[PDB]
Amino acid sequence: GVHSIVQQLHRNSIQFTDGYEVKEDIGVGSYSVCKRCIHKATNMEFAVKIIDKSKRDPTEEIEILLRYGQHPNIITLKDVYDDGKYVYVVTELMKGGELLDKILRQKFFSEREASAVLFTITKTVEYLHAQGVVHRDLKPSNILYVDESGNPESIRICDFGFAKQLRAENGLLMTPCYTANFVAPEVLERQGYDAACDIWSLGVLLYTMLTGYTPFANGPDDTPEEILARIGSGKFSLSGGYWNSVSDTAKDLVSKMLHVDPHQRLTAALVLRHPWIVHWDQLPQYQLNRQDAPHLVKGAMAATYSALNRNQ
């Protein structure tokens, strides 16, 4: 019967609208609304996610953000409130846009930049996995730039809304290195899987960065059945106008990250040992030959994640 500090936030005298001005929307959905806010005292602007407690309980999310937001490349919690009905999660606002989009509108993007981007993202996931966290919605739209600098220090992984802290009996938080509290080889494989999905979702990103098309969809018109069908077929082009020019190192990494069998799919650990990541210095800085269709890709990408999330 442990005290949770998060549960007690309705005890606060001060309210959100006492400290912050609200502005426009930026991300409406079933459970929550994301709005831009201005902090009255500082005139500093933030993102505030306004969640409905009747529709879900955002505690698991907030506890992850508290523990792991200090990570440079993880969205950072900045305030939080409870008025009874609504939880107000305040975080740094991502002014830089979605990372993939921005990158696809850069026509002189190179492999060398691609490796730096993946290194920063995969480093961050190696850390999360290592504390028995899995993201489980690591689609491109959830990886954003905090500013327009285009540094890898700008990269932020966002929306921890379906993420899972490997718990266990007695309601007790665990690592993947310690579960001497023998947990079912059932829900080691749940988390053992959901790690490798996070990695698959990173393979999709790398595929698209390199070529300017997603590997399992051409556009948003593509049907669920035919996207799932291609995912299942477990083959993909690493050949042709877009790929011809890309180094075999990169293609190799892509194959093992999107590898159809979860058990032979690379880890974040192993991704970071691949020479594409490790020997970045010997990669090319000259431009990639990519499709220039960012808005198509965004549709294709949404179509892909909507087929995967359909049954849930």
Curated annotation (Swiss-Prot):
Sequence positions bearing Phosphoserine:
S13, S154
- UniProt note on tissues of expression: Expressed in many tissues, highest levels in skeletal muscle.
Give the residues annotated as active site: D137
Q: Which residues are in the Protein kinase domain?
A: 20-277
Residues the entry annotates as binding ATP: I26, G27, V28, G29, S30, Y31, S32, V33, C34, K49
Positions bearing Phosphotyrosine: Y127
Location comes to:
Nucleus; Cytoplasm
PTM text:
N-terminal myristoylation results in an activated kinase in the absence of added growth factors.
Disease per record = Coffin-Lowry syndrome: An X-linked disorder characterized by intellectual disability associated with facial and digital dysmorphisms, progressive skeletal malformations, growth retardation, hearing deficit and paroxysmal movement disorders. Intellectual developmental disorder, X-linked 19: A disorder characterized by significantly below average general intellectual functioning associated with impairments in adaptive behavior and manifested during the developmental period.
Subunit structure, as described in the record: Forms a complex with either MAPK1/ERK2 or MAPK3/ERK1 in quiescent cells. Transiently dissociates following mitogenic stimulation. Interacts with NFATC4, ETV1/ER81 and FGFR1.
* Family membership: Belongs to the protein kinase superfamily. AGC Ser/Thr protein kinase family. S6 kinase subfamily.
Q: What does this protein do?
A: Serine/threonine-protein kinase that acts downstream of ERK (MAPK1/ERK2 and MAPK3/ERK1) signaling and mediates mitogenic and stress-induced activation of the transcription factors CREB1, ETV1/ER81 and NR4A1/NUR77, regulates translation through RPS6 and EIF4B phosphorylation, and mediates cellular proliferation, survival, and differentiation by modulating mTOR signaling and repressing pro-apoptotic function of BAD and DAPK1.
> What is this protein identified as?
Ribosomal protein S6 kinase alpha-3
Q: Which residues of the full protein are shown?
A: 403 to 714 of 740
